[PDB]
């Protein structure tokens, strides 16, 4: 385990035979050591007798305590899980070096020593906001954008994929990135080519989910995801509508706004504190960028600023090859009759009319896609 | 030539090296247990010695002594409180009250004093680890560093030309302007340089959810640092922990007043808090409550304002002095097309330029890099600016 | 099995024989709310919007092929509105009984919380029973919802990678709800 | 072998030393001269790669390759190319194995190629204290107008221009004249756990020189503030009566301007203790400068005063240090005496087989001849302690260090035939001219005649010994018996070992590296931290000071505090008081000043061992915690060529730098042009640091033409061909 | 009056002239001139006090913003 980290000739030299029948010499000495222990002292099998020896030492019930403090002479307070706490010795066998307060740890049944330590079975909150498989198809499946999907693997995917370039500039990536435009033009479709691409770690939440009904779980939850982000990985925090902490005040908060201030301070704090960061990559997106605070928007905490446009109309063009390209779609119609239909239709409006012509067909056990079938489709959609 | 033969000589002992280590003990991964050759020590004896003479000792904490006679008052966590008596071990000296103390489980007699419950949600604002900001780059505000400089540590490097003057120095300062001006990195670089214990506040870490839960949280540091013979405190974000009272109607944030109250008191009037300094950092101080801008607690009021226009040049060539550049190059230049802007966009403007240099080819910036560089951060990220509504502080 | 009873021994804590089955939270938390099992037999006058609730619901469990050969997206969410009293609970209430769904409704009550977690900071927390019993439907009532909802459409859109989950909204008067959630 | 390069001039160049090895493997020359002459005209940018390449090949070899290959290696920067500036520091490689002339024959080719000054300038600044001296004799030819009178300013200018170091450059970063505060570090304790003012040892203050003496270095010169070390130098301690004298000579450090000047108004007190270790101060200050300040005036009027204690011992220590860089046979005859008196205060004996030792490291066997008598003529009649066997066995391997030519095990093992008791010194000589190279077959006669045997308390001291010379070989193979080291002792010493591991295995760490890197760093606080209280618990704790061994300062003191903090009452005061606070003191002894370990320019060594190598010897293992060993746990290792390389030294001294620092290099064989290293974030132009794997470059088209490989005084030319 | 005891104070002070200087401050501001009086004698390396100095300390403690005003009269 980690023995020896020289790989560098990388052919069929001499020095790489050397090297390794070098360290197979280091082996066998070291082998051959060790094998005159049990031959002039066997005094034991040391494969169960010395652990055999520890497990008659430990009892058989092992009751779960909780560290609060430890004093490094091998005995520390601990908490029993009633609440009355002691101040049992810990042991030997024991690797002093696991122990944090509030580590949930393993008694003695007797004299409530502290044996052994608990590997700890989180989280229920770890999980919910660490993205679990890469989501959906490639940055292929976006279209029409192209000066802005630049932008992002620019501060995102090439800093983290080519670890060259900016050393030879002599110069550190931007930090911050914010997505901003009308609603339904593909904010949240650009994150997800992100997360199918990247190799770190990748936390999503939600702006609206910010907001708690106690006083003060707001700033605690803050603290926390930048706890889980930092101890990971090189990551990415995303934070999807971040303007629904400002606008939409509801009753369930019994702090007022001046409860919604004092969280957004406190994510004030973690984008560009004093606290070394490390590897952290933060993306944010919302449609009102007019509302929001200004101070978090210096550069510092956001460098970069991408607008996104409505769609063009021969960008329309391209996203209906996407939506219709898997399937047998009628050769009757036609569509750039589509396309200037609603003179500002968002990239949302055209999956929202292919998948519900699709519904259409379906009613009458078709198998392809009419012209009929998107002419309600629109009266369905849009005119309403 | 000898392909496979230098594979499988290398493949064999790397095997080899697993094949014996089995044999020696390190394996089974556990579930909390020690690698099998350190624990050797307590094997026989210390097993039979840390175990079977030495007992278990639940903790308390006494409630008071009384005259004549040992006698002590107990309280445990639960269950009742008792009268106890010392051991032969220990004198009744430092066995003063309202200290905790651990008690055997069958006489109920005091063993050892405890050193006390530190409230570790206190415990984890202690600094540990000091950061790489020097005072090399905090150029363009020289005046404002010197001023800060001469209250935070020459009366603790220093504590005799004071003293033989007969003055008093001062003890509490803030620091104050729009954002990103510099006030939260000159902080970083004040404990890079000292040497007392530094404990940092963010302001927004003392809401809690109970009430006078966070005046609690105020005592815990002030006792702690007291304890010290110098210490550093430093809050951040000040305006979340008080603006001002305004009591109104229904008591809408009448909770954070009271904490508000609390470091009010821990800094002035009846047995000082001694060699503590304090330094406060905001970004709106109009907020801010009469009796907390009173000196005697805020004595210095450092401003930070923006670079004028020799503090903008040396920004520049604080930031670039560390990149490829083409040499034939002017930052006095530059810095006349910046008129109000803070060293948080200058920085921003050399970390965008040498973008462009990566976006076509090349490996070293020009000058009309730098200039496609301005219009895009200062003029065209124009719409949102973050400082004019700073700068009445409103 | 984890998250089952035993018996065990007292002198020494030796486990002794494995006593049964207790509950699943899941199965005590519709045992609190106590919803009006209903079935079709007892549906009156609804045969359109029965037809209508089969294609979004009961066809991309059943037959989650035949969105392939038309090659779409498979549908996640239903809006029901109308007057109240006119049935939106037993016709929800129906379609997840027909084809053998969990039939998970959430009020954001505090009793139910002690079933879900300790805390449960998010909402999001729901989806680890949601995903245990998975072809489950979740139900939401009747402004707490419609941020709810929000929280739930966000995670099923792409990130979420299991299946057969599915979220039904009721209310009536829908010109007051949230523009986002009119997209 | 032509062929190779004739088709493309690829990465198949090095083939050839795949070619020119493997056909005639003992013979290299004559295959070497075939393809020297063929190389000669190859060319002149496919020069360096295949250079490297040999010294990748030299870095580790069998002793008649390590013979042979190493001088086939010279002539390529001197007949093919004349880049010629890497001659002294990479043909310190070639003195010791190959031939002492040999490298004095290119000590003659440096007095060859005399054009002009820049590079002449440059290759000598190292000829003086960077890897050794004893030159200063060679310079004094007929042209003594500037170009032979470098010799001055190379002994003592360009020293005093490393104290220019300090006096200028150190006072600007950081320095003020009393730091002081590493003590006032020592600070919570009193309140972390109820009440204090309880800690009232006297050994206490023999740490209590070290808030004077550790802090003082490079310039720290105190009026009045030695007064923790001048009223407890009139209040008790004898033997910290010599150690608050000799903690001055730490303080004027490199120093010949004021040093005898300062010692003499604490000198003048009539105490064989007081003035004994501040006339043993006096070599201190002057090690390194060598010129006119006591070759037999002050030292040799102190020793003979001699009929008693410090005054017969404490004077031949200073010399032996401030002349180790000599080789002067005189006053090696002066105090070879001092071994032929059969006087019998015995302590003073031990360590004068220690002052000659660090003197020369060649010939003069009536110096081993004048060890070996006094040695039969003693230790053969008695079987006791290791006051012989730390000390006498010791000066002889420090005379014959450095060459695998296995016939200084011939000389000397057959020498001391004799019981083996007397025999612990088998292994002395042995492999201290074993010092850096790869040998692996000594390795196996290093363990596998006493690995174990069970050993009822015979030659444990010996094995330990036998692993003591186990701690060497590791150092320099470059990293790669380094990992195959710590691989082998943690799981066969401390591990699963009796006595080798429990007392004394940990050692090697101390001798390995002062770099710090937490693989061994984490490791041997497991060892600590567990006390082991149930053996001789000082042999931890002689672990303790010692695992604080390494200089660069780091995050290690919290480490250190918090058994600071458990070894105020536990770990008793009573004989550890001084030592945690040794080891508390000596990681920031100042900030700068730490470059003690053994490789210069990228690899060389630079002795340095003969300093440092007596005091890993001298903890072995207890009694001389308190009266014998404070003459050897001050001022033991000496040899601090100090910190850094950011210097101009352009003939005004008015440059700064363009500089870069960056971690080590990874490149062996690659794409051209190789980059060289990727750590390019920090970029400075002044006297800062040098670090642990740093490689520093330049910028500006300065095109930094001097030198090109390392060594921290470049000239600093400049050129601009290149609009 | 009181705060200036410990200070070495030369007799060119005017407590009547700088009470008058000194309008609207309270009990903690009065004793806050007395201190940064004695760290700007401090600055510039004076043992006694005078009486500008007691004049430069007025400014530091009414912390006014110094923007480049000197186009009136
Ligand atoms: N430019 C586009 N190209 C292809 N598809 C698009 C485009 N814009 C939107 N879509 C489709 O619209 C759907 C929703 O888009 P998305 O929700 O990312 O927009 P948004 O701006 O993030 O919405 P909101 O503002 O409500 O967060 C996506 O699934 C995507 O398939
Ligand atoms: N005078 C300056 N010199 C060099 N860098 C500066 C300067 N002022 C600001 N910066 C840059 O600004 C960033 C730090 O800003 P800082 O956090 O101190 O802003 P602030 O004044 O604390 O306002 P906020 O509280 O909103 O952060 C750093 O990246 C730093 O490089
Ligand atoms: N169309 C219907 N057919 C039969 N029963 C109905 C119908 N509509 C309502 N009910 C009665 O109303 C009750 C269910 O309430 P419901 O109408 O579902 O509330 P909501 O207002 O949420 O739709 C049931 O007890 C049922 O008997
Ligand atoms: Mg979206
Ligand atoms: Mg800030």
Not at chain 2, 337 to 350: D, K, Y
């Amino acid at each position: 385990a980690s023995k020896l980290p020289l790989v560098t000739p990388h052919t069929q030299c001499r020095l790489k035979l050397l090297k390794l029948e070098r360290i197979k010499d280091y082996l066998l000495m070291e082998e051959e050591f060790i094998r005159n222990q049990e031959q002039m002292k066997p005094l034991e099998e040391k494969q169960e007798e010395e652990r055999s020896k520890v497990d008659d030492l430990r009892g058989t019930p092992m009751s779960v305590g909780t560290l609060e403090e430890i004093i490094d002479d091998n005995h520390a307070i601990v908490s029993t899980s009633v609440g009355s706490e002691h101040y049992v010795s810990i042991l030997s066998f024991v690797d002093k070096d696991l122990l944090e307060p509030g580590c949930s740890v393993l008694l003695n049944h007797k004299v409530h020593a502290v044996i052994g330590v608990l590997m700890d079975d989180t989280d229920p909150l770890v999980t919910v906001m660490k993205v679990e498989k890469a989501p959906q198809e490639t940055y292929a499946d976006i279209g029409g954008l192209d000066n802005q999907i630049q932008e992002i693997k620019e501060s995102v995917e090439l800093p983290l994929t080519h670890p060259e370039y900016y050393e030879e500039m002599g110069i550190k990536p931007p930090k911050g990135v914010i997505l901003y435009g009308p609603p339904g033009t593909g904010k949240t479709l650009l994150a997800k080519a992100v997360a199918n691409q990247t190799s770190a770690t990748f936390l999503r939440v939600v702006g609206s989910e910010l907001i708690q009904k106690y006083l003060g779980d707001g700033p605690k939850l803050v603290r926390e995801l930048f706890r889980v982000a930092e101890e990971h990985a090189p990551s990415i925090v995303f934070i999807d509508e971040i303007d629904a902490i400002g606008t939409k005040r509801y009753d369930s908060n019994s702090g007022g706004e001046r409860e919604i201030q004092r969280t957004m301070l406190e994510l004030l704090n973690q984008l560009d504190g004093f606290d070394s960061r490390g590897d952290v990559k933060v993306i944010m997106a919302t449609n009102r960028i007019e509302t929001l605070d200004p101070a978090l928007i210096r550069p510092g905490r956001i460098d970069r600023k991408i607008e996104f446009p409505l769609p063009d109309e021969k960008t329309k063009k391209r996203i209906f090859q996407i939506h219709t390209s898997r399937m047998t779609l009628a050769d009757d119609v036609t569509l750039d009759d589509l396309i200037m239909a609603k003179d500002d239709l968002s990239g949302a409006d055209i999956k929202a009319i292919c998948t519900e012509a699709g519904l259409m067909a379906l009613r009458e056990r078709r198998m392809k896609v009419t012209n009929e079938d998107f002419k309600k489709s629109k009266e369905n959609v849009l005119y309403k | 030539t000898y392909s496979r033969q230098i594979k499988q000589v290398e493949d064999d002992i790397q095997q080899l090296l697993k094949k014996i280590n089995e044999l020696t003990g390190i394996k089974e991964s556990d579930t909390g247990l020690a690698p099998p050759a350190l624990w050797d020590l307590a094997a026989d004896k210390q097993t039979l010695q840390s175990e079977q003479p030495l007992q278990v000792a639940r903790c308390t904490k006494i409630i008071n002594a009384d005259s004549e006679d040992p006698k002590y008052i107990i309280n445990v966590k639960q269950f009742a409180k008792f009268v106890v008596d010392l051991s032969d071990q220990v004198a009744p000296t430092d066995i003063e009250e309202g200290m905790r103390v651990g008690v055997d489980r069958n006489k109920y007699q005091i063993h050892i004093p405890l050193p006390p419950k530190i409230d570790p949600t206190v415990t984890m604002m202690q600094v540990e680890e000091k950061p790489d900001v020097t005072y090399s780059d905090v150029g363009g505000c020289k005046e404002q560093i010197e001023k800060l400089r001469e209250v935070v540590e020459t009366p603790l490097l220093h504590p005799e030309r004071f003293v033989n003057l007969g003055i008093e120095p001062p003890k509490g300062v803030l620091l104050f302007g729009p954002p990103g001006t510099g006030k939260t990195l000159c902080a970083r670089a004040v404990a890079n340089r000292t040497d007392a214990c530094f404990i940092r506040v963010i302001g927004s870490e003392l809401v809690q959810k109970y009430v006078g839960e966070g005046a609690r949280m105020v005592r815990e540091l002030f006792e702690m640092a007291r304890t010290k013979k110098a210490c550093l405190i430093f809050f951040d974000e000040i305006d979340a922990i008080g603006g001002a009272r305004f009591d109104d109607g229904a008591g809408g944030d009448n909770e954070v007043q009271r904490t508000m109250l609390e470091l009010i008191n821990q800094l002035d009037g009846f047995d000082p808090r001694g060699n503590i300094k304090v330094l406060m950092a905001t970004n709106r101080p109009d907020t801010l409550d009469p009796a907390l801008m009173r000196p005697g607690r805020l004595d210095r009021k450092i401003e930070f304002s923006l670079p004028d226009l020799e503090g903008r040049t040396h920004i520049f060539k604080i930031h670039a002095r560390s990149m490829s550049v083409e040499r034939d190059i002017r930052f006095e230049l530059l810095a006349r097309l910046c008129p109000n802007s803070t060293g948080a966009e200058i920085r921003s403007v050399c970390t965008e330029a040498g973008m462009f240099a990566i976006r076509a080819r090349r490996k070293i910036a020009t000058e009309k890099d730098f200039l496609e560089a301005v219009n895009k951060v200062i003029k065209s990220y124009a719409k949102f600016s973050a400082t004019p509504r700073y700068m009445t502080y409103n | 099995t984890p998250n089952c009873r035993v018996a065990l021994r007292n002198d020494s804590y030796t486990l002794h024989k494995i006593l049964p089955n207790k509950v699943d939270p899941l199965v005590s938390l519709m045992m609190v709310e106590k919803v009006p099992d209903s079935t079709y037999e007892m549906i009156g006058g609804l045969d359109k919007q029965i037809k209508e609730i089969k294609e979004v619901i009961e066809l991309p469990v059943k037959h989650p092929e035949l969105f392939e050969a038309l090659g779409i997206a498979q549908p996640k969410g239903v809006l029901l509105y109308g007057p109240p009293g006119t049935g939106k609970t037993l016709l929800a209430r129906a379609v997840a009984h027909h084809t053998d769904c969990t039939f998970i409704r959430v009020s954001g009550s505090e009793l139910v919380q002690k079933f879900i977690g300790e805390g449960a900071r998010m909402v999001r927390e729901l989806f680890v029973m949601a995903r245990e019993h998975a072809p489950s439907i979740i139900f939401m009532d009747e402004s707490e919802v419609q941020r709810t909802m929000l929280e739930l459409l966000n995670q099923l859109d792409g990130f979420e990678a299991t299946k057969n989950i599915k979220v039904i909204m009721a209310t009536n008067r829908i010109d007051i709800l949230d523009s986002a959630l009119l997209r | 072998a032509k062929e190779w390069q004739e088709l493309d001039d690829a990465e198949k160049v090095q083939r050839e030393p795949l070619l020119t090895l493997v056909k005639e493997i003992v013979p290299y020359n004559m295959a070497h001269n075939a393809e020297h002459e063929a190389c000669d005209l190859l060319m002149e940018i496919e020069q360096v790669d295949m250079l490297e390449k040999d010294i990748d090949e030299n870095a580790y070899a069998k002793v008649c390759l390590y013979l042979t290959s190493c001088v086939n290696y010279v002539p390529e920067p001197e007949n093919s190319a004349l880049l010629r500036c890497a001659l002294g520091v990479f043909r310190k490689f070639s003195r010791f194995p190959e031939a002492l002339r040999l490298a004095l024959m290119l000590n003659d080719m440096e007095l060859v190629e005399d054009i002009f000054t820049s590079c002449k300038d440059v290759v000598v600044q190292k000829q003086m204290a960077f890897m050794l001296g004893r030159h200063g004799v060679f310079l004094e030819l007929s042209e003594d107008v500037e170009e032979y009178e470098d010799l001055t300013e190379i002994m003592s200018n360009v020293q005093l221009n490393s104290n220019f170091l300090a006096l200028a450059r150190e006072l600007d970063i950081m320095e003020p004249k009393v730091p002081d505060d590493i003590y006032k570090t020592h600070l919570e304790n009193n309140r972390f756990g109820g009440s204090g003012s309880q800690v009232d040892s006297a050994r206490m203050n023999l740490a209590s020189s070290f808030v004077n003496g550790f802090v003082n270095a490079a310039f720290g010169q105190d009026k009045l503030l030695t007064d923790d070390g001048n009223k407890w130098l009139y209040k008790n301690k004898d033997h910290g009566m010599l150690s608050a004298a000799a903690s001055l000579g730490m303080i004027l450090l490199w120093d010949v301007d004021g040093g005898l000047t300062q010692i003499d108004k604490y000198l003048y007190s009539s105490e064989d203790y007081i003035k004994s270790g501040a006339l043993l101060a006096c070599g201190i200050v002057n090690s390194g400068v060598r010129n006119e300040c006591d070759p037999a005036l002050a030292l040799l009027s102190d020793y003979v005063l001699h009929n008693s204690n410090t005054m017969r011992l404490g004077s031949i220590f200073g010399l032996g240090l401030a002349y180790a860089g000599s080789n002067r046979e005189d006053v090696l005859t002066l105090l070879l005496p001092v071994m032929g008196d059969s006087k019998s205060s015995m302590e003073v004996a031990g360590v004068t087989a220690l002052a000659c030792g660090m003197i020369a490291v060649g010939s003069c066997n009536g110096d081993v001849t004048s060890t070996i008598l006094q040695t039969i003529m003693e230790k053969s009649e008695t079987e006791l302690k290791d006051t012989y066997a730390r000390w006498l066995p010791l000066g002889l391997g420090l005379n014959h260090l450095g060459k695998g030519e296995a016939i200084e095990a011939i000389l000397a093992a057959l020498e001391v035939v004799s019981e083996p008791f007397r025999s612990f010194a088998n292994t002395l000589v042995d492999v201290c001219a074993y010092a850096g190279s790869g040998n692996v077959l000594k390795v196996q006669q290093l363990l596998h005649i006493c690995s174990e045997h069970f050993d009822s308390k015979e030659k444990e001291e010996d094995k330990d010994k036998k692993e003591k010379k186990d701690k060497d070989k590791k150092e320099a193979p470059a990293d790669m018996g380094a990992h195959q080291g710590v691989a082998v002792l943690g799981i066969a010493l401390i591990a699963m070992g009796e006595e080798i591991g429990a007392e004394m295995a940990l050692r090697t760490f101390g001798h390995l590296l002062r770099y710090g890197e937490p693989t061994l760093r984490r490791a041997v606080p497991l060892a600590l931290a567990l006390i082991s209280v149930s053996n001789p618990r000082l042999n931890i704790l002689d672990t303790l000071s010692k695992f604080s061994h390494d200089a660069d300062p780091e995050v290690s003191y919290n480490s250190i505090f918090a058994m600071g903090m458990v070894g105020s009452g536990t770990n008793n005061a009573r004989l550890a008081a001084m030592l945690r606070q040794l080891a508390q003191y000596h990681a920031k002894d100042p900030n700068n000043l730490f470059m003690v370990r053994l490789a210069q320019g990228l690899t060389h060594l630079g002795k340095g061992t003969l300093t440092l190598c007596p005091y890993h010897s001298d903890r072995q293992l207890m009694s001389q915690v308190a009266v014998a060993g404070l003459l050897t746990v001050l001022v033991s290792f000496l040899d601090v060529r100090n910190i850094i390389l950011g210097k101009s030294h352009y003939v005004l001294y008015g440059l700064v730098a363009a500089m870069q620092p960056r971690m080590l290099v990874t490149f062996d064989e690659e794409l051209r042009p190789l980059p060289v290293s990727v750590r390019v974030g920090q970029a400075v132009d002044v006297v800062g640091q040098a670090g642990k794997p740093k490689t520093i470059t330049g910028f500006q088209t300065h095109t930094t033409p001097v030198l090109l490989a390392h060594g921290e005084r470049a000239e600093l030319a400049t050129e601009e061909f290149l609009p | 009056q009181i705060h200036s005891r410990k200070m070495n104070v030369s007799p060119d002070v005017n407590y009547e002239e700088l009470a008058r200087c000194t309008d609207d401050f309270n009990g903690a501001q009065c004793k806050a001139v007395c201190v940064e009086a004695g760290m700007i004698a401090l600055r510039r390396g004076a043992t006694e006090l005078t009486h500008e100095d007691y004049m430069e300390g007025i400014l530091e403690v009414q912390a006014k913003k110094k923007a480049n005003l000197q186009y009136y009269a």
